[PDB]
Design a protein around this ligand. Structure first.
Ligand SMILES: CCCCCCSC[C@H](NC(=O)CC[C@H]([NH3+])C(=O)O)C(=O)NCC(=O)O
Ligand SMILES: CCCCCCSC[C@H](NC(=O)CC[C@H]([NH3+])C(=O)O)C(=O)NCC(=O)O
Lengths: 216, 216
């Protein structure tokens, strides 16, 4: 019984988790809820044995989890990727949070009718946020050094998303540009992005003003 | 050189961390930025050796951290409180996320001019969120069982906050009511809440429409 990953058929909160599973070459099945299957989800929500019913959820022979960050960290933890000591684990958790400020920064304004105006303010703040990652990568192949960790896939997802908002937001950040290409150069990832399992759109929920809809 | 915890002189994102430090009886100093000291923060922001400059930050003889969740988890990790195995650590991370949905649910609408209207929608969703914790606590003293973990202080903070929004939101949840009292019954916590170090207000930043200002 291979693990089941449930979520809307969008990138959203679970995309980084998918990339991690693919990177690790872990077998898994997905239960994807289409745009008109909310009803299907509601009728199963409290019937899966989940303590805190939500999307995404992860069910396998050992656990039943919800909360996207708990799920991605569980998968990484099962592969001894969370960090070898408190200091290292904290570094990795700090990177997570830093990436979320960007990813969630996008989603918080993506559902507004005044997206364009909010976008201006967000994009004026994005540079400073990106620069901390740029500096972090000037002497490191990946966020935690020579080896890939789950925050790398989180950052990748965030970069993919902001590049849709503004294709030139990385022009002043060559290391981030190269980092994104480097992630796509990982064999498992390249294979995944080219497979039928890859969900390129939407970024947020279908109803979103930005990153929504059925097509880019 | 005891650890330094920097943050605005508000509860906000760091309150649970303060409670954890007090619970563990760890010595620490705080660098509190008053409402009119933003300028003071800006001039120090990139001068503290922080890789991802932000508030709160935690600096001690071993690390320099930012991102509230990385900080609270570091402190807990130093005391072997994050979980003994992947499954347990994931349970604890799931609880964190579940609490944040509530705490951040409040902050996302607390800065709006239309707070009252947004409040109505939030409070109609809060019950379902609280009920998952209520059920979790029907056969457990604390969120993870007989012993306290950092999510307990996170939940406490969230309950403290929503009780300000609606003093009756816990009427249908007796276990959560008792849980809040149980936390306040911990000697270190009772002592802290009664000390001069305790910051009762504001909940969000001073500019917030809800939980803001200099006085309740
Ligand atoms: C960040 C970019 C895009 C975000 C799209 C929204 S995610 C779907 C939504 N789930 C959540 O909001 C989960 C939040 C939770 N904190 C987590 O991280 O898992 C849902 O439908 N949950 C099911 C339910 O509420 O019943
Ligand atoms: C949740 C209830 C109340 C929230 C009040 C806002 S927190 C202060 C703000 N910091 C952040 O937003 C940090 C976000 C980061 N994700 C974290 O969790 O630490 C700041 O002034 N950072 C300093 C800066 O940006 O220079």
């Amino acid at each position: 019984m291979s693990p089941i990953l449930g979520y809307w058929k969008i990138k959203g909160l679970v995309q980084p988790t998918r990339l991690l599973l693919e990177y690790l070459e872990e077998k898994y099945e997905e239960h994807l809820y289409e745009r008109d299957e909310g009803d299907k989800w509601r009728n199963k929500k409290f019937e899966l044995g989940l303590e805190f019913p939500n999307l995404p959820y992860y069910i396998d022979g050992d656990v039943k989890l919800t909360q996207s960050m708990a799920i991605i960290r569980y998968i990484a933890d099962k592969h001894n990727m969370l960090g070898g000591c408190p200091k290292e684990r904290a570094e990795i958790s700090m990177l997570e949070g830093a990436v979320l400020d960007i990813r969630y920064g996008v989603s918080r304004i993506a559902y507004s009718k005044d997206f364009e105006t909010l976008k201006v303010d967000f994009l004026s703040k994005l540079p400073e946020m990106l620069k901390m990652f740029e500096d972090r990568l000037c002497h490191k192949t990946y966020l935690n050094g020579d080896h890939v960790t789950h925050p790398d896939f989180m950052l990748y997802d965030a970069l993919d998303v902001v590049l849709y908002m503004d294709p030139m937001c990385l022009d002043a950040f060559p290391k981030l540009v190269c980092f994104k290409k480097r992630i796509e150069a990982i064999p498992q990832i390249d294979k995944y992005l080219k497979s039928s399992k890859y969900i390129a759109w939407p970024l947020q929920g279908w109803q979103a003003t930005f990153g929504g809809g059925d097509h880019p």
